Design an enzyme around this catalytic site. Sequence first.
Site, PDB file in Angstrom:
ATOM      1  N   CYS A   1      -9.981  19.101  53.153  1.00 11.07           N
ATOM      2  CA  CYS A   1      -8.932  18.046  52.909  1.00 11.07           C
ATOM      3  C   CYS A   1      -8.946  17.422  51.510  1.00 11.07           C
ATOM      4  CB  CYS A   1      -9.184  16.949  53.918  1.00 11.07           C
ATOM      5  SG  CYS A   1      -9.925  17.807  55.320  1.00 11.07           S
TER       6      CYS A   1
ATOM      7  N   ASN B   1      -4.631  10.670  52.631  1.00 10.41           N
ATOM      8  CA  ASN B   1      -5.970  11.087  53.098  1.00 10.41           C
ATOM      9  C   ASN B   1      -6.479   9.918  53.877  1.00 10.41           C
ATOM     10  OD1 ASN B   1      -9.375  11.466  52.087  1.00 10.41           O
ATOM     11  ND2 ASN B   1      -8.212  12.773  53.486  1.00 10.41           N
ATOM     12  N   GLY B   2      -6.907  10.143  55.115  1.00 12.63           N
ATOM     13  CA  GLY B   2      -7.375   9.071  55.944  1.00 12.63           C
ATOM     14  C   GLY B   2      -6.695   9.115  57.279  1.00 12.63           C
TER      15      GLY B   2
ATOM     16  N   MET C   1     -29.641  -4.682  78.857  1.00 10.96           N
ATOM     17  CA  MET C   1     -29.496  -3.744  79.968  1.00 10.96           C
ATOM     18  C   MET C   1     -27.979  -3.403  80.235  1.00 10.96           C
ATOM     19  SD  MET C   1     -31.612  -2.081  80.353  1.00 10.96           S
ATOM     20  CE  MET C   1     -33.334  -1.559  79.828  1.00 10.96           C
TER      21      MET C   1
ATOM     22  N   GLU D   1     -32.789   4.715  67.493  1.00 14.48           N
ATOM     23  CA  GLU D   1     -32.325   4.147  66.251  1.00 14.48           C
ATOM     24  C   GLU D   1     -33.341   3.682  65.217  1.00 14.48           C
ATOM     25  OE1 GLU D   1     -29.279   1.983  67.201  1.00 14.48           O
ATOM     26  OE2 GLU D   1     -28.430   1.577  65.145  1.00 14.48           O
TER      27      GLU D   1
ATOM     28  N   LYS E   1     -22.299  -0.732  73.520  1.00 16.29           N
ATOM     29  CA  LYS E   1     -21.505  -1.420  72.519  1.00 16.29           C
ATOM     30  C   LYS E   1     -20.769  -0.504  71.505  1.00 16.29           C
ATOM     31  CE  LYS E   1     -25.451  -3.501  70.484  1.00 16.29           C
ATOM     32  NZ  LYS E   1     -26.808  -2.863  70.674  1.00 16.29           N
TER      33      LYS E   1
HETATM   34  C1  LIG Z   1     -33.357  -0.303  75.832  1.00 18.34           C
HETATM   35  C2  LIG Z   1     -32.448   0.678  75.222  1.00 18.34           C
HETATM   36  C3  LIG Z   1     -32.580   1.104  73.924  1.00 18.34           C
HETATM   37  C4  LIG Z   1     -31.638   1.964  73.385  1.00 18.34           C
HETATM   38  N1  LIG Z   1     -31.692   2.349  72.082  1.00 18.34           N
HETATM   39  C5  LIG Z   1     -30.814   3.253  71.563  1.00 18.34           C
HETATM   40  C6  LIG Z   1     -31.050   3.696  70.268  1.00 18.34           C
HETATM   41  O1  LIG Z   1     -31.994   3.285  69.583  1.00 18.34           O
HETATM   42  N2  LIG Z   1     -30.195   4.624  69.741  1.00 18.34           N
HETATM   43  C7  LIG Z   1     -29.141   5.049  70.503  1.00 18.34           C
HETATM   44  O2  LIG Z   1     -28.457   5.848  69.908  1.00 18.34           O
HETATM   45  N3  LIG Z   1     -28.878   4.644  71.804  1.00 18.34           N
HETATM   46  C8  LIG Z   1     -29.789   3.759  72.347  1.00 18.34           C
HETATM   47  N4  LIG Z   1     -29.725   3.343  73.654  1.00 18.34           N
HETATM   48  C9  LIG Z   1     -28.922   4.077  74.685  1.00 18.34           C
HETATM   49  C10 LIG Z   1     -29.601   5.265  75.346  1.00 18.34           C
HETATM   50  O3  LIG Z   1     -30.011   6.066  74.283  1.00 18.34           O
HETATM   51  C11 LIG Z   1     -28.630   6.034  76.248  1.00 18.34           C
HETATM   52  O4  LIG Z   1     -27.426   6.305  75.580  1.00 18.34           O
HETATM   53  C12 LIG Z   1     -28.375   5.133  77.429  1.00 18.34           C
HETATM   54  O5  LIG Z   1     -29.562   4.445  77.323  1.00 18.34           O
HETATM   55  C13 LIG Z   1     -28.654   5.716  78.781  1.00 18.34           C
HETATM   56  O6  LIG Z   1     -28.029   4.915  79.738  1.00 18.34           O
HETATM   57  P1  LIG Z   1     -28.625   4.797  81.195  1.00 18.34           P
HETATM   58  O7  LIG Z   1     -29.419   3.641  80.616  1.00 18.34           O
HETATM   59  O8  LIG Z   1     -27.821   4.211  82.279  1.00 18.34           O
HETATM   60  O9  LIG Z   1     -29.843   5.627  81.627  1.00 18.34           O
HETATM   61  C14 LIG Z   1     -30.601   2.415  74.144  1.00 18.34           C
HETATM   62  C15 LIG Z   1     -30.479   1.972  75.448  1.00 18.34           C
HETATM   63  C16 LIG Z   1     -31.405   1.099  75.981  1.00 18.34           C
HETATM   64  C17 LIG Z   1     -31.297   0.640  77.389  1.00 18.34           C
HETATM   65  C1  LIG Z   2      -6.999  15.335  55.780  1.00 22.92           C
HETATM   66  S1  LIG Z   2      -6.482  14.029  56.901  1.00 22.92           S
HETATM   67  O1  LIG Z   2      -7.620  14.209  57.949  1.00 22.92           O
HETATM   68  O2  LIG Z   2      -6.678  12.713  56.125  1.00 22.92           O
HETATM   69  C2  LIG Z   2      -5.053  13.944  57.801  1.00 22.92           C
HETATM   70  C3  LIG Z   2      -4.298  12.718  57.650  1.00 22.92           C
HETATM   71  C4  LIG Z   2      -3.442  12.225  58.783  1.00 22.92           C
HETATM   72  N1  LIG Z   2      -4.042  11.305  59.722  1.00 22.92           N
HETATM   73  C5  LIG Z   2      -2.846  13.405  59.472  1.00 22.92           C
HETATM   74  O3  LIG Z   2      -2.954  13.543  60.804  1.00 22.92           O
HETATM   75  O4  LIG Z   2      -2.127  14.245  58.723  1.00 22.92           O
HETATM   76  O1  LIG Z   3     -33.811  -1.271  67.522  1.00 21.56           O
HETATM   77  C1  LIG Z   3     -32.586  -1.312  66.983  1.00 21.56           C
HETATM   78  O2  LIG Z   3     -32.324  -1.440  65.657  1.00 21.56           O
HETATM   79  C2  LIG Z   3     -31.436  -1.107  67.918  1.00 21.56           C
HETATM   80  C3  LIG Z   3     -31.775  -0.919  69.397  1.00 21.56           C
HETATM   81  C4  LIG Z   3     -30.377  -1.130  70.005  1.00 21.56           C
HETATM   82  O3  LIG Z   3     -29.300  -1.418  69.248  1.00 21.56           O
HETATM   83  C5  LIG Z   3     -30.134  -1.115  71.532  1.00 21.56           C
HETATM   84  O4  LIG Z   3     -31.136  -0.585  72.179  1.00 21.56           O
HETATM   85  O5  LIG Z   3     -29.066  -1.600  72.188  1.00 21.56           O
HETATM   86  S1  F3S Z   4     -37.775  -4.111  79.960  1.00 20.67           S
HETATM   87 FE1  F3S Z   4     -38.380  -6.051  80.734  1.00 20.67          FE
HETATM   88  S2  F3S Z   4     -36.774  -7.218  80.014  1.00 20.67           S
HETATM   89 FE2  F3S Z   4     -36.005  -5.206  79.869  1.00 20.67          FE
HETATM   90  S3  F3S Z   4     -35.253  -5.416  81.888  1.00 20.67           S
HETATM   91 FE3  F3S Z   4     -36.850  -3.960  81.796  1.00 20.67          FE
HETATM   92  S4  F3S Z   4     -37.776  -5.746  82.655  1.00 20.67           S
END
Ligand SMILES: Cc1cc2nc3c(=O)[nH]c(=O)nc-3n(C[C@H](O)[C@H](O)[C@H](O)COP(=O)(O)O)c2cc1C
Ligand SMILES: CS(=O)(=O)CC[C@H](N)C(=O)O
Ligand SMILES: O=C(O)CCC(=O)C(=O)O
Ligand code: F3S
EC number: 1.4.1.13
Length: 1452
Positions: free
Chosen positions: A1, A231-232, A476, A883, A934
């Site tokens: 692009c 672009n975008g 949680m 993370e 989130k």
């Molecule tokens: C305590 C905790 C820490 C987590 N930390 C990360 C993280 O560091 N990076 C990330 O990409 N997702 C993180 N997640 C999300 C998990 O990687 C995963 O996507 C999700 O936990 C699984 O959901 P389930 O909890 O119902 O088993 C975190 C989730 C929890 C509960």
């Molecule tokens: C290279 S591009 O990804 O910016 C494409 C731009 C635009 N959202 C489209 O659908 O044409």
């Molecule tokens: O430890 C961190 O910087 C992020 C952990 C986090 O964002 C999550 O577990 O929801």
């Molecule tokens: S970790 Fe401790 S507070 Fe997180 S809820 Fe699981 S009890």
Amino acid sequence: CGVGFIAAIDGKPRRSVVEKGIEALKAVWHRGAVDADGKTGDGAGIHVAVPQKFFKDHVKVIGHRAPDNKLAVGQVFLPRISLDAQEACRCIVETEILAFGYYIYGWRQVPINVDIIGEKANATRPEIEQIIVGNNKGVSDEQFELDLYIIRRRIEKAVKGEQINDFYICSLSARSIIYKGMFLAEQLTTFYPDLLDERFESDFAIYHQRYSTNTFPTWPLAQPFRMLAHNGEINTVKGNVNWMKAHETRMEHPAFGTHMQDLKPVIGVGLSDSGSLDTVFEVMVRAGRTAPMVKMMLVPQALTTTPDNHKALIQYCNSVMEPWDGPAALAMTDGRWVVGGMDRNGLRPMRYTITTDGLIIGGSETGMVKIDETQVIEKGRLGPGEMIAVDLQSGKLYRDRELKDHLATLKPWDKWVQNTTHLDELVKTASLKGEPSDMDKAELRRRQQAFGLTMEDMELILHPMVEDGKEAIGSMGDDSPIAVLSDKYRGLHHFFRQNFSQVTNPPIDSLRERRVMSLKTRLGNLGNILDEDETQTRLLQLESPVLTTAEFRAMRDYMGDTAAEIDATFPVDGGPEALRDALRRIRQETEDAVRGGATHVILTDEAMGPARAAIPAILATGAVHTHLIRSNLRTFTSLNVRTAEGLDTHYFAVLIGVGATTVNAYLAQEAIAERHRRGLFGSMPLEKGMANYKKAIDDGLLKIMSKMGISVISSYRGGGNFEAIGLSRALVAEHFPAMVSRISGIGLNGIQKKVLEQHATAYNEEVVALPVGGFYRFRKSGDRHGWEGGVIHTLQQAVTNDSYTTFKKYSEQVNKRPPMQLRDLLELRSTKAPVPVDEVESITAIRKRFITPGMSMGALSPEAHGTLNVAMNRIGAKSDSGEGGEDPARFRPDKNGDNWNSAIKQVASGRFGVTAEYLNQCRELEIKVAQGAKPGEGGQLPGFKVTEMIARLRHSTPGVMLISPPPHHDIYSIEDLAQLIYDLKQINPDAKVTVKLVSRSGIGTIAAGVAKANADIILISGNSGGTGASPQTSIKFAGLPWEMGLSEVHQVLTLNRLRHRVRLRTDGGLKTGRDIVIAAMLGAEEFGIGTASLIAMGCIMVRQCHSNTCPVGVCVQDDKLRQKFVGTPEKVVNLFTFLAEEVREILAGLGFRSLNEVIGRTDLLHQVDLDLNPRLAQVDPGGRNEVPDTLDARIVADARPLFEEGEKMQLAYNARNTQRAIGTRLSSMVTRKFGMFGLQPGHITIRLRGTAGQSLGAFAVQGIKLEVMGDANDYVGKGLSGGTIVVRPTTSSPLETNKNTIIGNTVLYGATAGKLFAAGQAGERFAVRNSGATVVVEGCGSNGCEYMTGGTAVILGRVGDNFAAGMTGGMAYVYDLDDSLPLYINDESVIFQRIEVGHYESQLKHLIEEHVTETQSRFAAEILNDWAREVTKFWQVVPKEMLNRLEVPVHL
Ligand SMILES: Cc1cc2nc3c(=O)[nH]c(=O)nc-3n(C[C@H](O)[C@H](O)[C@H](O)COP(=O)(O)O)c2cc1C
Ligand SMILES: CS(=O)(=O)CC[C@H](N)C(=O)O
Ligand SMILES: O=C(O)CCC(=O)C(=O)O
Ligand code: F3S
């Protein structure tokens, strides 16, 4: 692009302008999906001037005489398979040009060579034909295009009425003509030879290749469009689109004469986002506005530094038209001007060069077209909001300032702006005069009960708002039912999910970047986008759609005769159709009112009583706004709502974006008071009370918005950015703006019934206390949750005592309840007789498809974290670092054989421990674009969890909080993803790359692009997953169930034949054998299990993960508390063992002897109202994705000695904008043999002439040094890891080192070690997240040093807005010759002083010396020559939190 543009500053046509235009298009392919097919691409285009020699001759050769004027051409795609239609098409085309009485010399089949096209494309290839028109009427340049314009629309329209498909007029003017089509840009010239003719000459050019979320090629969707090239992406599009439905209701200008109606709708069906933009941009320009004015009215810069003329103007625009937001590099031109523009956040690259030959070449990257340094007079770029332009009539170039100066000049912007009534102060006044309250607790309580409110609601969520002026944070996942399935009155807002953005565009930082955002609100500013008269400033203006009961009435009075109040309520004695007719009524009454002359509407539940239920404000607002649009009336009022049910940020967001201008949560200010008279807020006046509430809801919104990069409420409003889960299709269509509701759900009749039931609850008898509530937490009360005590105990019992029988009793406990989640609504029946369990695949086998998600070191105790790594490696599976870093000690198995190292490492926004060695200690890299807890946002780690070990890991500052940037800084659009994946596969040749995405409708499509971008695995996360810390609205309102997103990806990927290119993984609440089978049938191959793995390690689900008070040592950094941890590998291993065995138990019943035999097999699931079909449907019923070498390929080859003997080496090579990630492979190799630091600086040095393309030197460890004599593009030293990179202009360039750009954006993103030296300026977000690299550079775009946490950052020059925002820890000095830095820097976390202590003054000096030594920089050298006077000019920028930590104090 790419987008690009070229222009002869003097105005005079040339062939080189086109030849350059091609030249460009030949250097962008490194940024796209190459097909193995060799031919197929998404679209390319070049927009040049109709070449009158070339054409005229043509007319001559047939033997006409060339006219004196300019000769027009239509460039047209006709249906190519139905001759019958081509005709209809040509009659229409001719008729229309004919009634304007112009003249037809006639058709010309365009030469083209379809050999270079792929079949997919030749399939949908239209029949390309030119039609030549003459200005027999002798009108003027300006009149010809005007007329032609009305003609093209006329055609466009008739073809439509005829119902003709595939017709399309790229261009049809006598100034410009467009040659776009579906073929590789490098081959534009091949598919269309006209372009290679010397008669094609031109004063300007605009090229553009494009990418997509597809395999399907439509031809009209390739750009450049008629005026525009983009672009975008424009995330704010549905917003814009619906606004035009009203903007139009009034647009009228005299240039179109009687034509206007043919002129509408300005936006036809089937347009791409940019296409729709060009559509609007065009009308506006056709009616008189210059190009530059229009860029502004539509993609205005942020009104945060700014002269006052500009501000006027801006304010003007903002009042006429609501922006079109989204990352956007634009290349534009109305007939005369040629413009390069930026979006308000500088979201996309856009370099440019100016030559001695009097040309400007606009670009996305820079090495894009040869130019001898020798003839370069300047080397710029655009920053957020800027433009650069050329007025071809006068052959004058205008840079941003000078251009904006000019437009300020056009009218009495300020005098005009001064015409607005800011009813703010008038409103704040009445608040201080006293936020009233008139209900007695006996009431509050009972209404409150009507909308089913609770204590949890009052204590948990409302309170913190009032107190801290911030919204409740929590922890949680969300394990409650999904609202439709709920058992308990939930309010509409529950079914609307906030949308957010994933790879298409980045979300913004509403903390660090709040200055660009905004909540201004205007009542009555909806008139003639077409007009340009001061009467356009006559409107009232708030600064938040939000009003406290005080301020509300303030306003409602100022309005008066002008306002109208509609009774959003209905009888209960009513009948089965009560709410329906109610909804009609309101709809009509508002009509009459508005017609009648009314100019403001006030919709309200106030008359709710024992005899009247309230209409769900959300539903009432939408019903009204829509019908208003549907009758062209919304343009005549403001629409303001009073709601008794409203309470949190989400509710406002929905209301607003489904219409609402203004909202007043009246029964909540009430509830606030009551709290306040029991002194629950203490000393604090009820007024300051509300104030806070209000800020919490204001930042509330700003946030919810940023989740889909949107910076401004006016575009957000009414845009319907939600997705409905649970309400019926018909309904959602009927009454709210466009939103998806992939399974219909309840409708009015259900809604009615539930509304009324809760109603009886509250007027059927006395009410002294609300119920407790167990929505945000399990109480042994009403709301159920997945994880509830019994269930947790039994599981714990099970993995602790190691009994599968206990496990089985748990899962039964779990499966025998009422449905709570979609999968719960499915039965699994099959047609095979059952098989013996022994026969099925083995646990060893199965458990390997399981993984333990990424949960950070930080969020969890060190003990918990490594526990997991040990369990997973013990059973040959995989775990995910998370993370936040991973300690490298951990890179070996221990005396006991246990292995603490984790197999899959993440890469997320704040690049935590991201290191050449980290990236290399794994089998898989997970790009974390998002978590279901989130989606729109990015991690948090409370400061008191930022232990020192933690801080050491992360290169952060101890005990200071880590909030992450919501978007990755190097992933602002899909090509961007694409390139990250390349670097990733470059630094680690063995790993697969994954992309964590979060289910939501639309994921499917993205999923595809991810696939074309070389990702190996794609993971869709459910709305309900867990987080150690996260605001509660996201935990309860962002995301969608995995059952929807996971199939959508399965489907779409299949539908584009990419589904075999990538493996699929999912997580979100999977606690049971069956949960895992069903996910397979929906398409999954891998399953992630977090929380339940936590619970086995002991979690008791008490929810204080953010607090650092874990009863059990799971998620807490506190020492004493970490000693209460009893997790064990053995426990987790037992968890997985059970799960798999329970999986095998199920497959056997189904007759399958393996999981694979059942992936995708949705025919095995039946839904036992909602429509679960779209999820069950089958599309066609009945190693790693490798990557191209780079320079590193040779460098390595040339370095034998290095690796073989240890030698030291100096290599030289040229470098083009087309070579990416140079060195990164080298680095991987070096890190592997000597480690990040076993080589002494400069051991292997590679000089490069030319231009480095993206990711230059990314992840370079020490020992490597790259000199780039020439220049570079975005991401120099991304993740720098102790290696060294230097970049200076060519000895022969005559450029003033410091007055010219030299390296792109997001330089040093997340670095941790090494130096970088740059004879020149750097672009936006320089040194973002730097965690320990030392750099010297002669200038820098905006948003610099942002979120920096370590390292030294010198800076010989001017510095962009918001400098140092969130800069918690490192230090930057900053040579400032105008004592301006004060006006640009972001105070909040940093301070600046002049150097005083002399070790800080010495530190600087030595760097600058280094800089010079490396870069031979004059300007630098000279500062050295006058150190004395000069040191005087810098400014030490030092982080508050670093003041007392710093060995040598900064002061005295
Ligand atoms: C305590 C905790 C820490 C987590 N930390 C990360 C993280 O560091 N990076 C990330 O990409 N997702 C993180 N997640 C999300 C998990 O990687 C995963 O996507 C999700 O936990 C699984 O959901 P389930 O909890 O119902 O088993 C975190 C989730 C929890 C509960
Ligand atoms: C290279 S591009 O990804 O910016 C494409 C731009 C635009 N959202 C489209 O659908 O044409
Ligand atoms: O430890 C961190 O910087 C992020 C952990 C986090 O964002 C999550 O577990 O929801
Ligand atoms: S970790 Fe401790 S507070 Fe997180 S809820 Fe699981 S009890």
